[PDB]
Amino acid sequence: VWVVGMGIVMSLIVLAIVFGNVLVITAIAKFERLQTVTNYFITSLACADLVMGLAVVPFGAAHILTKTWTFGNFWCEFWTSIDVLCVTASIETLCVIAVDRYFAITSPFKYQSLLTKNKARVIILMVWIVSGLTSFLPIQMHWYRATHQEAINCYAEETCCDFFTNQAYAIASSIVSFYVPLVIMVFVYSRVFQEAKRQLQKIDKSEGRHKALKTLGIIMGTFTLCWLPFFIVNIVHVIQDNLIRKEVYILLNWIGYVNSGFNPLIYCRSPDFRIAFQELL
Ligand SMILES: CN[C@@H]1CCc2c(ccc(O)c2O)[C@H]1O
């Protein structure tokens, strides 16, 4: 009396993610005015989220629902690699956008000289290649496989494949994916908020007759609430053998996936985007 209900929520999540990302992608391609040098990063993030919603989630829901990985044994290694790729690429693209904002605010005159049209392609390719090296190469040739007797059967068994990692791959993946981008974004947005406050205070000197806090709160709260617990539990269950159950890990991992669906609403609400959305439909 519970199988049908949860599948409805899963289908709504999948449909929402796919619809949002497809609309965001088609908006930029359709209209010339929406195109911008900075908007290519949004295109990359939208592509990553669309790939996640097209591949990772629908297959991962079947494992939860039917409780049997009825697909082939070779496929789920590819599935895990795709999941890691789709997480790392999105997080690093968000970090790139934050750094772009810092350059835009803290250096007006020199902003054009630093960033040009062609540099965006190089940055995107570097981000995606770094995402590829951390996921496909270790997963496919099996550095990550654990040595303890448990789960060796599941690696051998065709019906089973669950994530199990040594004490090194978890640390390396967590450091590459989460902590460094978090530090970079924190410092960048701290400086941006300081500059905005300085200007807001300066105006009141010559005008003798809030918004930044709200927007920064939204941007940091969404990302931190989405992704902070997952990497903490990822580190902790590997530092000590038994402190975390599997169900909690699965729940936190699935909560982490909803972020890719919220990105279009967070980052695409400018008047030009609204006009484009109205024009499309
Ligand atoms: C199947 N779930 C995986 C497991 C570990 C992991 C994920 C995402 C990014 C990483 O850097 C990871 O190490 C999760 O999506």
Residues annotated in the binding site for (S)-timolol, as ranges? 83, 88, 234, 253, 257
**Break sites following residues in the chain (C–N > 2.5 A):** 209
- The dihedral built from the CA positions of residue 161, 167, 168 and 171, taken in this order, carries a sign that is positive
The structure tokens listed for 112 are 């054009």
Rounded distance, CA 91 to CA 48, Å?
A: 10
- The alpha carbon of 83 and the centre of ligand 1 are apart by a number of angstroms equal to 7
Instruction: Evaluate: CB of 177 within 6 angstroms of ligand 1.
Output: yes
Contact 90, 17 (CB under 8 A): no
**Domains in the chain, CATH or no CATH each:** 3-280 (1.20.1070.10)
| Distance separating the N- and C-terminal Cα atoms of the chain | 39
Instruction: Evaluate: CB of 173 within 6 angstroms of ligand 1.
Output: yes
Instruction: Evaluate: CB of 78 within 6 angstroms of ligand 1.
Output: no
Using what technique was this structure determined? cryo-EM
Rounded distance, CA 260 to CA 19, Å?
A: 12
Rounded distance, CA 222 to CA 216, Å?
A: 10
Residues annotated in the binding site for (S)-carazolol, as ranges? 83, 173, 253
Instruction: Evaluate: CB of 84 within 6 angstroms of ligand 1.
Output: yes
The amino acid sitting at 257 is Y
Rounded distance, CA 180 to CA 99, Å?
A: 13
Contact 256, 31 (CB under 8 A): no
Pocket test for ligand 1, best of 51, 59, 84, 154 (most atoms within 8 A of CB): 84
Resolution of the PDB structure in angstroms: 3.6
- The alpha carbon of 84 and the centre of ligand 1 are apart by a number of angstroms equal to 5
